[PDB]
Amino acid sequence: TTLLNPYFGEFGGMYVPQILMPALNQLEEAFVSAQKDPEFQAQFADLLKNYAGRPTALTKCQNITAGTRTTLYLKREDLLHGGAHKTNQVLGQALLAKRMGKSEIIAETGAGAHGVASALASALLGLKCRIYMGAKDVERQSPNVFRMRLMGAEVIPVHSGSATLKDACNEALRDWSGSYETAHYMLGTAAGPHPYPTIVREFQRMIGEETKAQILDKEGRLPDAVIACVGGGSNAIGMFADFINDTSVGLIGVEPGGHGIETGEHGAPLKHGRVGIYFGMKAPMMQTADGQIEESYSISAGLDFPSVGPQHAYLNSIGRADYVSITDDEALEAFKTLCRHEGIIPALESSHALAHALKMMREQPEKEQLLVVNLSGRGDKDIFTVHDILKARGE
Amino acid sequence: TTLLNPYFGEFGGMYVPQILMPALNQLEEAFVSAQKDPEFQAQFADLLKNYAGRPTALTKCQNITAGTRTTLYLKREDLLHGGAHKTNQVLGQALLAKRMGKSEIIAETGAGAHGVASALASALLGLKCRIYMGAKDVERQSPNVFRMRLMGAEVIPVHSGSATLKDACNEALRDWSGSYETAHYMLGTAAGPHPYPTIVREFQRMIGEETKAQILDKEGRLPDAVIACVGGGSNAIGMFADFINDTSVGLIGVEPGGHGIETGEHGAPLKHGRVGIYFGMKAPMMQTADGQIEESYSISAGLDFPSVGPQHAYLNSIGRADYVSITDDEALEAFKTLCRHEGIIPALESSHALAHALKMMREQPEKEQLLVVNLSGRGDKDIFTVHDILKARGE
Amino acid sequence: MERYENLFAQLNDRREGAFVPFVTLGDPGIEQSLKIIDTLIDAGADALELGVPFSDPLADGPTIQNANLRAFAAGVTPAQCFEMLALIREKHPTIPIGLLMYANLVFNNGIDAFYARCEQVGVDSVLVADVPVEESAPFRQAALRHNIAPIFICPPNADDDLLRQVASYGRGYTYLLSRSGVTGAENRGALPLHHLIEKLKEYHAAPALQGFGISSPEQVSAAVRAGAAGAISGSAIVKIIEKNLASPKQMLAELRSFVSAMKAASRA
Amino acid sequence: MERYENLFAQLNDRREGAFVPFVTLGDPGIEQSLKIIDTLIDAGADALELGVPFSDPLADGPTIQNANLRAFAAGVTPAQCFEMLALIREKHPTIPIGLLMYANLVFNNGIDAFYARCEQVGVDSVLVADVPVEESAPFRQAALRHNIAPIFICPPNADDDLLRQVASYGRGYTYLLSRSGVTGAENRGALPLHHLIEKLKEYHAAPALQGFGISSPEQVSAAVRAGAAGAISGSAIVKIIEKNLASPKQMLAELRSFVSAMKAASRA
Ligand SMILES: Cc1ncc(COP(=O)(O)O)c(C/N=C(\CNc2ccccc2O)C(=O)O)c1O
Ligand SMILES: Cc1ncc(COP(=O)(O)O)c(C/N=C(\CNc2ccccc2O)C(=O)O)c1O
Ligand SMILES: O=P(O)(O)OCCNS(=O)(=O)c1ccc(OC(F)(F)F)cc1
Ligand SMILES: O=P(O)(O)OCCNS(=O)(=O)c1ccc(OC(F)(F)F)cc1
Ligand SMILES: [Cl-]
Ligand SMILES: [Cl-]
Ligand SMILES: [Cl-]
Ligand SMILES: [Cl-]
Ligand SMILES: [Cl-]
Ligand SMILES: [Cl-]
Ligand SMILES: [Cl-]
Ligand SMILES: [Cl-]
Ligand SMILES: [Cl-]
Ligand SMILES: [Cl-]
Ligand SMILES: [Cl-]
Ligand SMILES: [Cl-]
Ligand SMILES: [Cl-]
Ligand SMILES: [Cl-]
Ligand SMILES: [Cl-]
Ligand SMILES: [Cl-]
Ligand SMILES: [Cl-]
Ligand SMILES: [Cl-]
Ligand SMILES: [Cl-]
Ligand SMILES: [Cl-]
Ligand SMILES: [Cl-]
Ligand SMILES: [Cl-]
Ligand SMILES: [Cl-]
Ligand SMILES: [Cl-]
Ligand SMILES: [Cl-]
Ligand SMILES: [Cl-]
Ligand SMILES: [Cl-]
Ligand SMILES: [Cl-]
Ligand SMILES: [Cl-]
Ligand SMILES: [Cl-]
Ligand SMILES: [Cl-]
Ligand SMILES: [Cl-]
Ligand SMILES: [Cs+]
Ligand SMILES: [Cs+]
Ligand SMILES: [Cs+]
Ligand SMILES: [Cs+]
Ligand SMILES: [Cs+]
Ligand SMILES: [Cs+]
């Protein structure tokens, strides 16, 4: 029994060990209660505005669309405190943790952005925070490990499996299953068991709300499409949510194509996987013929996850949202292009969304289109990775 | 002959080789013209809001003042695009460069924050940017070198002298003296020859303006004091300017005390130097008995400069503003304290201002005081330096 | 069939509890796994709980994680596990065989088809670790259609509604969780479970086996004394495999003595 | 005194231009510097321009930057430079001596006191590199009070107002800048300066010496042919010091031949 619908069509649900159901039910109840509580809402609003820096800018990028009929705006989640959109929902979930009397936080991270957001919110609000991070991601996103430790969070390297995000998720869930009385699992994306896909969307939806208001103010109309990268689904559903009922507005999610879909080394289960049950949810999975969960791959640690949140699978199934992929190389070009021509250093994750927008423009340069890319984070964490890549290319 | 007063009392002026006077006069004229030009103002406003992310939050920090009668707010220049207040005036000066038909930018940097700001503004606005940076600062603020190069700026290591900020300034000025027809010198602080101290203040004054409005909204009165670190003077004068005529409001600037004033290894000329002529201005200098300019020292590359802007020297002389110092160790403690208790990672520069505010609180804990610290930047650039220090301490 | 029903009736007559070992099928290889399982039975196991190697066993701690990995290193697939189950049932006609599954392996090629295959090879029960009661409908329906007992978990944090559901929906045995957390011999359950055991009996639930953290004969006796019908032990058994990889002979000897001792504890 | 006035009157009578070398005082040491300066004079220098080592010489390129550093390595101070100037004037009663100063060294112990010291030791002019006309009042006033010629710069980018000011305020000689930029032999001035030379003459300015980038006899002749009263050469001279640090004898020989050749170029 739940208060809210755990499914989006066939996708979603609560596929966790029985032991964890009371924790999920408690979380759902606290969320429903909080959503009706003006004091909770005011506290949340206060943190978003005065601590995190909302609303974020919507930047019109002129140089990179020159000579085309594309007008491109970037929603600047890269300017949020912490440096990524991850901060928004962490503030809301930390307040739920406190509401439920939890004193500890467990989080997974890949890009380290969610880890950093979890650590900063825990420092501010008086929670003891432990982060699971794949050992591969520890190296390729190291700036973030430094940040987390300085803010007093415990960072636990995970060497199992691919030593990336999936493996960190696994460990976080294992931990929670034995510590849920005292620890809240601050899941970092719009995926996992209900009620997380719902909560994460509702605590990210200000992205799209602000975008809509900003676009109307500047352009007097809605965008033709909004475009976001999809790792687990949070920044994209945060951008999409307020536009779902505006049927003229394209919703485009960009999965990582890695070394190319045909190589099998990608993170694009929504379009190239098949429905399975893992990480608490029924959702598209990269899986073997036999039903073993595969390892994903992306140059971007934050998109390196072999599944996807269920609301995205649903929105795809009904044709409301469209999903595409962008390779490592395409994302790297978009990264370089934004740095050099707009003076903005984007996260490699967000660079996937940008790459698709640039493709939309370049493929049809005389098509009039008003586009918004969710610039989900800044790329400080990626500057060393990108350096090493460009160096090996002799650039 | 000038349009504007080049002096603040005895301090300031235009002590450059004759060759550079037309460049200074042209810059002054363009500034005076721009300040009266609604189109310039609107373009500048547009960039500050929609590109840089202004206005910045004013955050009330609760944990770190618990048990005292200090209320402490942080003005969040760390959330500005680029990660420091340096971005504000760079946008204005880049627009002046364009107004004057310059196609190239020269900048010095120490912390790399001004370098990054110069590079990003040049990428956006179509200028070819070259940055001088001391070789010591290249290492201790390396994240910034990566950022500048990705945005297409040329970064030139300076090995001369102390291989720090002073030396970079020297090289930038030498360069400008032979390239001023095509290159604008985008000086990174409220110092140097007129009209730079005036321009930099006017292009930073939104800091204090916003602070005043925010404090009034939240507290219904002005702050007892506003507190800022002083490297060359820009973030501090940006905070101070709008409060100068509010005589009840304390203006406190914090110079780096380095290893301690008594060691001579500091960057505190305003309080521990004496008036001299260097870097285009008559201003307090760290100098030998013989009148040679000394080398400064600070753990923080951005404060490691042996002089200070003339308006600060003036405001000190008349008693309108008070100047103090904070040592490397005091700044490190403030850094750690903010990370752990507010979940904000501050620049080591800004940490000097915070340290003084914490001292004001701790020394007199039952004194009722409403304080604002200008949190001039984020400390991403410093995380490696701080790690290495804490590691060597066995922390 | 009625393998559990017959076992518990026989056990009740001898006034004894069940000892039920867990191992991963194909750990550390198919042939050695088959020998291990024969040794468990010869040493006095009353039933088996058998894990199919899964890529991401989220209810398992390191010991059994490593069992899964060893099986995968030997190239063990679900198909080969079904071949093994056929060979085990062929040798041992009466022993109840329960599978420990993760959902994706059951869902992968169709839920109904999975249970149909279990029936074909002579499996008696299926426990799907990451399917709570709330999601159980298609699993339990398919199980019952194919004469497989659906195994439900009664956690220490079970309320009355959950006891009633588990009592109604389950067959074969009720799984009584020692404690929160994941599998492992290093963490023993700290909560007394007598109240849950009595409630299950009142609601006519399948007989209860206690599992998680059971690593010593004393804990086996205590479960039985507390009113449970027996106990399951996994990590403790798997540890003996892991310790003796290089000596298959000493592996079997040590498994025999351990199982013997654990089983003897169920006799009073 | 009137050392410049006498020099230019003598030069005009011989229909020739001045050749004026620059060196840094105390580069590469006090004793060697004194010998270098005697060699410059013996080889035909008409006047001297002498730099006092300064920590931050912002109008100087690498060659002269390095001269400053060498002097500092030898521990040379402004006080020791004044001692040297006394020794030079003691040997050479008639040669005009101009200092190249940076502002802080003049301001440091009081502007008036600085010029008083210059007068005491027998210096004829002072050029303060980082003081434009706009800031010059206390410097030029103190210079004139102590019978020192204040040297003003006429840049290539000079407007009419600046020509008039430089003509009025200056004494001794007018410094005619070859080009923008800093000192150095590697960058030769590209602008013709004949228009500025004529305007200075019309406004009765002190005679003009061209400086910056003058490294060859041809450039000396060209300055004189263009109507200037002579030329200054610094980096070219200092390069010979730098090249010959390890051979003081070959240093002096090479300085002699260079200065001889440069001076000969001023004769037509
Ligand atoms: C700037 C930026 N932009 C986009 C993304 C993509 O994540 P999305 O917006 O949720 O789709 C990330 C994801 N980053 C991860 C992965 N986070 C993550 C991903 C999947 C499962 C669990 C996770 O913690 C992290 O741990 O920070 C990001 O940092
Ligand atoms: C975050 C932050 N906070 C405060 C400061 C202090 O500089 P202030 O606010 O101007 O006093 C810096 C100064 N940083 C320098 C030095 N900039 C600099 C300093 C002195 C002379 C020339 C310079 O370019 C840079 O080059 O970025 C900073 O980064
Ligand atoms: O002795 P231990 O601690 O290794 O435990 C052995 C357990 N092996 S098992 O197949 O019974 C078993 C039973 C239930 C499990 O998860 C669930 F409770 F969520 F369903 C996992 C394994
Ligand atoms: O031959 P070069 O290129 O080395 O030039 C030698 C110049 N030495 S100097 O003392 O005349 C001299 C004259 C003026 C200077 O700066 C100023 F113009 F700003 F005032 C600097 C040095
Ligand atoms: Cl739905
Ligand atoms: Cl359903
Ligand atoms: Cl609640
Ligand atoms: Cl609400
Ligand atoms: Cl630490
Ligand atoms: Cl781990
Ligand atoms: Cl808005
Ligand atoms: Cl509305
Ligand atoms: Cl409009
Ligand atoms: Cl559309
Ligand atoms: Cl549409
Ligand atoms: Cl599909
Ligand atoms: Cl695609
Ligand atoms: Cl004033
Ligand atoms: Cl004055
Ligand atoms: Cl203008
Ligand atoms: Cl204005
Ligand atoms: Cl590059
Ligand atoms: Cl250089
Ligand atoms: Cl405001
Ligand atoms: Cl007002
Ligand atoms: Cl108020
Ligand atoms: Cl006050
Ligand atoms: Cl006051
Ligand atoms: Cl003083
Ligand atoms: Cl002090
Ligand atoms: Cl695992
Ligand atoms: Cl492997
Ligand atoms: Cl546990
Ligand atoms: Cl220098
Ligand atoms: Cl040295
Ligand atoms: Cl030049
Ligand atoms: Cs366009
Ligand atoms: Cs993904
Ligand atoms: Cs307080
Ligand atoms: Cs300073
Ligand atoms: Cs039953
Ligand atoms: Cs004159």
Peptide bond into C28 cis (omega under 30): yes
Residues A369 and A292 in one domain: yes
CATH label of the domain that carries residue A175: 3.40.50.1100
For residue C62, give the 3-state DSSP assignment: helix
Q: Which of A204, A222, A238 is the last residue of a domain?
A: A204
Residues B219 and B357 in one domain: yes
Whether A251 is covered by a domain: the verdict is yes
Q: Which of A185, A204, A223 is the last residue of a domain?
A: A204
Tally the residues of chain A: 395
Task: Find out whether B18 and B37 touch, Cβ atoms under 8 Å.
Answer: no
Q: How far apart are CA D72 and CA B32, in angstroms?
A: 43
Peptide bond into D57 cis (omega under 30): no
- B182 to B114, B178, D180, D235, D242: CA distances (angstroms): 21, 10, 12, 26, 33
Angle A158-A163-A165 (CA atoms, 0-180°, nearest 5)? 90
Q: Which protein residue has the closest C-alpha to ligand 4 atom 8?
A: D234
CATH label of the domain that carries residue D96: 3.20.20.70
- Which residues, judged by CB distance below 6 Å to any ligand atom, belong to the binding site of ligand 4? B 17; D 22, 49, 51, 59, 64, 100, 127, 129, 153, 177, 183-185, 211-214, 232-236
Q: How far apart are CA D148 and CA D266, in angstroms?
A: 26
Tokens 């969304």, located at residue: A353
Task: Find out whether A95 and A384 touch, Cβ atoms under 8 Å.
Answer: no
Residues of B in contact with A151 (CB under 8 A): 339-340, 343, 345
For residue A211, give the 3-state DSSP assignment: helix
Which candidate, B203, B197, B204, places its Cα nearest to that of B281?
B197
Task: Find out whether A343 and A375 touch, Cβ atoms under 8 Å.
Answer: no
Whether A395 is covered by a domain: the verdict is no
Peptide bond into D28 cis (omega under 30): yes
Find the A103 Cα to ligand 7 centroid distance in Å.
15
Task: Find out whether A337 and A59 touch, Cβ atoms under 8 Å.
Answer: no
Task: Find out whether B269 and B306 touch, Cβ atoms under 8 Å.
Answer: yes
Residue of A25, A181, A288, A292 best to disrupt the C interface, most CBs of C under 10 A? A292
Query: What is residue A115's DSSP assignment?
Result: H
Residues B68 and B130 in one domain: no
CB contact under 8 A, B177 and D180: yes
Q: What strand order describes the sheet that includes B321-327? A: B58-60, B70-76, B369-375, B225-229, B250-258, B321-327
Residue A368 is part of which domain span?
53-85+205-390
How many other C-beta atoms are found inside a 10 Å radius of the C-beta of residue B4?
12
Find the D61 Cα to ligand 36 centroid distance in Å.
9
Supply the Cα-derived Rg of chain A in whole angstroms.
19
- B329 to A272, B390, B393: CA distances (angstroms): 55, 11, 12
Whether B181 is covered by a domain: the verdict is yes
CB contact under 8 A, B291 and D109: yes
In C, minimum Cα distance to A295 occurs at C55
Q: Please report how many Cα atoms fall inside a 13 Å half-sphere around the Cα of residue B196, on the Cβ side.
A: 29
The structure tokens listed for A184 are 């809240």
Whether B111 is covered by a domain: the verdict is yes
Residues A253 and A319 in one domain: yes
Alpha-helical runs (H) found in chain D: 3-13, 30-42, 62-73, 78-91, 103-107, 111-121, 137-145, 160-169, 194-202, 217-225, 235-243, 248-264
Residues of D in contact with B166 (CB under 8 A): 56
Residues in CB range of A138: below 8 A, 6 or more apart: A145, A155, A157
Find the D184 Cα to ligand 36 centroid distance in Å.
8
Residue of B49, B50, B128, B375 best to disrupt the A interface, most CBs of A under 10 A? B50
- D45 to A10, A153, B362, D267: CA distances (angstroms): 97, 73, 69, 12
Phi-psi region at B384: left, alpha or beta (left = phi > 0; alpha = psi -120 to 50): alpha
In D, minimum Cα distance to B2 occurs at D134
Task: Find out whether B79 and A56 touch, Cβ atoms under 8 Å.
Answer: no
CB contact under 8 A, C132 and A16: yes
Chains that touch C (3 or more CB pairs under 8 A): A
Q: Mutation test of ligand 1: which of A235, A252, A375 has the most ligand atoms closer than 8 Å to its C-beta?
A: A235
Which candidate, D233, C180, B64, places its Cα nearest to that of A17?
C180
Find the B41 Cα to ligand 21 centroid distance in Å.
6
Largest interatomic CA distance in chain D:
49
Q: How far apart are CA D250 and CA D236, in angstroms?
A: 16
Find the D181 Cα to ligand 4 centroid distance in Å.
10
Residue type, A60: K
How many other C-beta atoms are found inside a 10 Å radius of the C-beta of residue A79?
26
Task: Find out whether C183 and C64 touch, Cβ atoms under 8 Å.
Answer: yes
Q: Mutation test of ligand 4: which of D23, D49, D66, D100 has the most ligand atoms closer than 8 Å to its C-beta?
A: D100
Q: How far apart are CA B51 and CA B45, in angstroms?
A: 10
Task: Give the total number of structural domains in chain B.
Answer: 2
Whether A3 is covered by a domain: the verdict is no
Report the residue from C65, C107, C155 with minimal CB separation from A18: C155
Whether A41 is covered by a domain: the verdict is yes
| Resolution stated for this PDB structure, in Å | 1.6
Find the D60 Cα to ligand 4 centroid distance in Å.
7
Residues in CB range of A192: below 8 A, 6 or more apart: A169, A279, A280, A281
Which candidate, D178, D233, D175, places its Cα nearest to that of D206?
D175
Compute the count of residue pairs across chains B and D with CB atoms less than 8 Å apart: 94
Peptide bond into A195 cis (omega under 30): yes
Residues A323 and A338 in one domain: yes
- Which residues, judged by CB distance below 6 Å to any ligand atom, belong to the binding site of ligand 1? A 84, 86, 108-115, 165, 169, 188-189, 191, 229-236, 302-303, 305, 347, 349-350, 376-377
Q: Which of B140, B171, B204 is the last residue of a domain?
A: B204
The structure tokens listed for B156 are 């030139």
CB contact under 8 A, A345 and B126: no
CB contact under 8 A, D104 and B173: no
Q: Please report how many Cα atoms fall inside a 13 Å half-sphere around the Cα of residue D166, on the Cβ side.
A: 29
Interface of A with C in 243-302 (CB under 8 A): 276-278, 280, 282, 285, 287, 290-294
C78-91 and C111-121 are packed helices; what angle lies between their axes, rounded to 10 degrees? 30
Residues of A in contact with B381 (CB under 8 A): none
User: Could you tell me which residues of chain C have a Cβ less than 8 Å from any Cβ in chain A?
Assistant: 54-56, 58-59, 61, 65, 77-79, 103-105, 107-109, 129-135, 152-155, 157, 162, 177, 179-182, 187
Q: How far apart are CA B201 and CA A371, in angstroms?
A: 37
D160-169 and D194-202 are packed helices; what angle lies between their axes, rounded to 10 degrees? 50
Which candidate, B84, B82, B158, places its Cα nearest to that of B122?
B82
- In sequence order, the β-bridge partners of residue B277 are B282
Residues B327 and B220 in one domain: yes
Task: Give the total number of structural domains in chain C.
Answer: 1
Burial class of residue D25 (count of CB atoms within 10 Å of its CB; 0-12, 13-18, 19+): buried
Residues A150 and A186 in one domain: yes
Q: What is the DSSP string of B33-64?
A: HHHT-HHHHHHHHHIIIIII-PSPPEEE--GG
Task: Find out whether A239 and A190 touch, Cβ atoms under 8 Å.
Answer: no
Distance from CA of D130 to the nearest CA of B (A): 4
- Which residues, judged by CB distance below 6 Å to any ligand atom, belong to the binding site of ligand 2? B 84, 86, 108-115, 165, 169, 188-189, 191, 229-236, 302-303, 305, 347, 349-350, 376-377
Q: How far apart are CA B143 and CA B380, in angstroms?
A: 8
Task: Find out whether B179 and B154 touch, Cβ atoms under 8 Å.
Answer: no
Residue D103 is part of which domain span?
1-268
Tally the residues of chain D: 268
Residues B320-335: b if buried by 16+ CB within 10 A, e if exposed: ebebbbbbbebbbbbb
Residues A37 and A60 in one domain: no
Largest interatomic CA distance in chain B:
59
Catalytic residue among D16, D49, D124, D254: D49
Whether residue A132 lies within 8 A of chain C, CB to CB, comes out as no
Burial class of residue B356 (count of CB atoms within 10 Å of its CB; 0-12, 13-18, 19+): buried
B142-150 and A383-392 are packed helices; what angle lies between their axes, rounded to 10 degrees? 60
Residues B288 and B341 in one domain: yes
A113-125 and B328-342 are packed helices; what angle lies between their axes, rounded to 10 degrees? 90
Supply the Cα-derived Rg of chain C in whole angstroms.
17
Q: How far apart are CA A267 and CA B218, in angstroms?
A: 46
Task: Find out whether D148 and D159 touch, Cβ atoms under 8 Å.
Answer: no
Distance from CA of A103 to the nearest CA of C (A): 18
- Does C41 contact ligand 3 (Cβ within 6 A)? no
Residues A210 and A339 in one domain: yes
Supply the Cα-derived Rg of chain B in whole angstroms.
19
For chains C and A, tell me whether 3 or more CB atom pairs sit within 8 A of each other. yes
